A paper describes a structure:
Pseudomonas aeruginosa is a Gram-negative pathogen responsible for a significant level of hospital-acquired infections, particularly in burns victims and immunocompromised and cystic fibrosis patients. In an effort to accelerate early steps in drug discovery, the EU-funded AEROPATH project aims to identify novel targets in the opportunistic pathogen Pseudomonas aeruginosa by applying a multidisciplinary approach encompassing target validation, structural characterization, assay development and hit identification from small-molecule libraries. The crystal structures of eight of these targets, ranging from hypothetical unknown proteins to metabolic enzymes from different functional classes (PA1645, PA1648, PA2169, PA3770, PA4098, PA4485, PA4992 and PA5259), are reported here. The structural information is expected to provide a firm basis for the improvement of hit compounds identified from fragment-based and high-throughput screening campaigns.
Uroporphyrinogen III (U3) is the first cyclic tetrapyrrole compound in the haem-biosynthesis pathway and is located at a metabolic branching point. From U3, biosynthetic routes lead to haem, sirohaem or cobalamin (vitamin B12). The structure of P. aeruginosa uroporphyrinogen III synthase (HemD, PA5259) was solved to 2.4 Å resolution using Se-SAD phasing.
Author numbering: 3 to 251
The structure:
């Protein structure tokens, strides 16, 4: 059967490993990014104290929901009236567990899916619309750029930095060989980049394996890097990965 390398951050990695194990798929976890919470600056705290200026808040990732909820809880006994948005169901559920109503697409692989969602566009129907994006220190500029194009002002709240964990030399190749892995999962472009960087000289070998990517954009990024077997899952969730595994080899 399928024997997969997972490369997602540690917390999301364990939840995926468990789902895959429950479905009877073997996996080995090698997080290619670690999540380092950011120290809130005075300018960032001000954004949070003025959270009620935003008609929508977009949470781009599971760590952004977790860390973003900490600051919400810190500064808001009662959350202001605004629309909370997510790209996927899995990010939405962290917010939902807190008690928020979340706007998100059902297909939901990428920023585009949220951007095109009628419920999301409706939340922008406001005088001088302002949106807050909760995310890492860096990321995709697409959503901000597009929102600004429609006359929406866009602020970022960085919550964490993403860094490559330090592994003993050869960890990636050792894992693929020792665990007889026949597939790789990445869940983002940065994750895919870190994989290429860590593969280094063994990339011709590693790039050979079925590479399961969450979206068309990441699929394109992977071809550009020389990955020979690029597989587009319809999103980053476990069910999406299972359906993609069934269809592949
Ligand atoms: Cl992954
Ligand atoms: Cl970052």
């Amino acid at each position: 059967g399928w024997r997969l390398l997972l490369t997602r951050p540690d917390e999301e990695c364990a939840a995926l490993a468990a789902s895959l194990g429950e479905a009877g798929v073997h996996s080995s976890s090698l997080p290619l990014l670690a999540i380092d919470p950011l120290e809130e600056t005075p300018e960032q705290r001000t954004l949070m104290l003025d959270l009620d200026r935003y008609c929508a808040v977009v949470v781009v990732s599971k760590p952004a929901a977790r860390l973003g909820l900490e600051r919400l809880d810190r500064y808001w006994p009662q959350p202001p009236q605004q629309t909370w948005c997510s790209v996927g169901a899995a990010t939405a559920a962290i917010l939902e567990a807190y008690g928020l109503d979340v706007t998100y697409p059902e297909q939901g692989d990428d920023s585009e899916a949220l951007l095109a969602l009628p419920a999301f566009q409706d939340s922008l129907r406001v005088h001088d619309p302002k949106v807050l994006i909760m995310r890492g220190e860096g990321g995709r500029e697409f959503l901000a750029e597009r929102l600004r194009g429609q006359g929406v002002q866009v602020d970022y709240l960085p919550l964490y930095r993403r860094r490559a964990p330090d592994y003993p030399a050869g960890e990636l190749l050792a894992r693929v060989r020792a665990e007889r892995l026949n597939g790789l999962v990445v869940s983002s472009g940065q994750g895919l980049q870190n994989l290429y960087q860590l593969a280094a000289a063994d990339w011709p070998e590693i790039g050979r394996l079925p590479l399961f990517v969450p979206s068309p954009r990441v699929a394109e990024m992977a071809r550009e890097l020389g990955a020979q077997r690029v597989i587009d899952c319809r999103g980053a969730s476990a069910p999406a990965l299972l359906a993609a595994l069934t269809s592949a080899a």
